[PDB]
Design a protein that fits this description.
The complex is a heterotetramer, with 2 copies of chain A and 2 copies of chain B. Chain A is mainly α. Chain A has a single domain, classed as Orthogonal Bundle (Retinoid X Receptor), CATH 1.10.565.10. Chain A is about 65% helix and about 5% strand. Chain A contains 9 helices and 2 strands. In chain A, strands 1-2 form a two-stranded antiparallel ribbon. In chain A, helix 5 packs antiparallel against helix 8 and helix 6 packs antiparallel against helix 7. The longest helix of chain A has about 35 residues. Classes of the chains: A mainly alpha. At the A-C interface, helix 5, helix 7 and helix 8 of A face helix 4, helix 6 and helix 7 of C. The structure holds estradiol (2 copies). One estradiol (EST) binds next to helix 2, helix 3 and helix 8 of chain A. Chain C: Belongs to the nuclear hormone receptor family. NR3 subfamily. Chain C: It comes from Homo sapiens. Chain C: This is Estrogen receptor. Chain C: It is found in: Nucleus; Golgi apparatus; Cell membrane.
């Protein structure tokens, strides 16, 4: 765990990556607000099952008590879905690749009340990734950092792992040729995006709560409890 | 216990 | 901009706003807290104009960043003030509220808990004044993806690293501590989002008189 | 609007 080298950490996280799932998109019909929310939540639900298995493969996570594992995942699940979405969407300017069969533009986001605002933030973040030329190895480090960090102040072991992931990011950047100053500058640029992902998660959680509270879409028992955790 | 608590054990 | 690391630090220390004072029901506590926030907001604008590079942005950008960041900025200030007072929040020198006084206001204790947890974290890290003013400037410049800004942000990262090198930290320790500090900004964003929802709910109840400035800063978030 | 002028 804390014993892993930088390269071993990267390989572990790369091996742990979940598959890219398909949506139930039905191209025979136009979208409604209800059918679009149904597609996205149906997708989220199936991704959550893979997320749980992925989390258990992040170094140090299964050493935590079950209660702390639950808390971290409850806190981070939507940040984790969103950073994955933004990563998948990098090579598709102006579009969000929810799934290979569900590539949506901001105009399609208007189909759901209050959703285009959140699409616009996700698209902006994807553009930021693109212009930074975010690498796959950096992405998997960031996503694991979100898992371990977002709920961590609501433990010394967690921070040791987080420190190891920092070491790993720096390792990757040095290996890619960045100067010593470029390494700390890029480390900071990448970590500051985590503040933007938190923000998007909080706005998306409020959005999903509204959709629920308006009976727009029936949420799975899992989604109801994940949403409930945010009280 | 939360559903997640159980799901985390299957593994 | 062409500033040295130490010049940047001096600039940020000199730009610091004053520590203000306060003058209990749900209504009175919210009255004091919002009254305080309103007065602090006036000083925040003056401080922002002195963050190196900020006034070089367009007016529109300046408004946007302040509207986005103001509650994060109030909160990191609060957490900093509270750092040497375990279990308490030093809103002002004559308004030092312990954890349980947050129960006077509905929905407030959970926010108190997050602020107290952040203050603990700062204390565990032995956060320094010079680090604190760098972080607060990063919040201003970062919080509102809504090139010159990125160069100022890089300059402040350089300044944090300079401070840590000067403190004797190894390169490995510098990078670890830099990451630890910036990960705290994700938590500060979360608290601001929650606090904004809370403030909105108090407005809607129309319990507490909110200043016009405060209503506009709140409105920017919808 | 206040902010707009204050900053001026
Ligand atoms: C949570 C929402 C439904 C699920 C969406 C989803 C679903 C799957 C996925 O991989 C990413 C995202 C990000 C945005 C999410 C949406 C933001 C608002 C909406 O309610
Ligand atoms: C905005 C709130 C009132 C003003 C509070 C304040 C007021 C002054 C200050 O320096 C810091 C803070 C942080 C938390 C704020 C509160 C969180 C929710 C509450 O409505």
């Amino acid at each position: 765990a804390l014993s892993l080298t930088a390269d071993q950490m990267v390989s572990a996280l790369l091996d742990a990556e979940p598959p890219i799932l398909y949506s139930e998109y039905d191209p025979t019909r136009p979208f409604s607000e209800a059918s679009m929310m149904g597609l996205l939540t149906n997708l989220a639900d199936r991704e959550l099952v893979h997320m749980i298995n992925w989390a258990k493969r992040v170094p140090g996570f299964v050493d935590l008590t079950l209660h702390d594992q639950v808390h971290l995942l409850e806190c981070a699940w939507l940040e984790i879905l969103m950073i994955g979405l933004v990563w998948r969407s990098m090579e598709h300017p102006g579009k969000l690749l929810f799934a290979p069969n569900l590539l949506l533009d901001r105009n399609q986001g208007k189909c759901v009340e209050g959703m285009v605002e959140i699409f616009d933030m996700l698209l902006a973040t994807s553009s930021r990734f693109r212009m930074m030329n975010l690498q796959g190895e950096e992405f998997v480090c960031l996503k694991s950092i979100i898992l371990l960090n977002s709920g961590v102040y609501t433990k010394d072991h967690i921070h040791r792992v987080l420190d190891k992931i920092t070491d790993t990011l720096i390792h990757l950047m040095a290996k890619a040729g960045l100067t010593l100053q470029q390494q700390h500058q890029r480390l900071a640029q990448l970590l500051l995006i985590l503040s933007h992902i938190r923000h998007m998660s909080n706005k998306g959680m409020e959005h999903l709560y509204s959709m629920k509270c308006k009976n727009v879409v029936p949420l799975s028992d899992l989604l109801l409890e994940m949403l409930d955790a945010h009280r | 216990h939360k559903x997640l608590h159980r799901x985390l054990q299957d593994s």
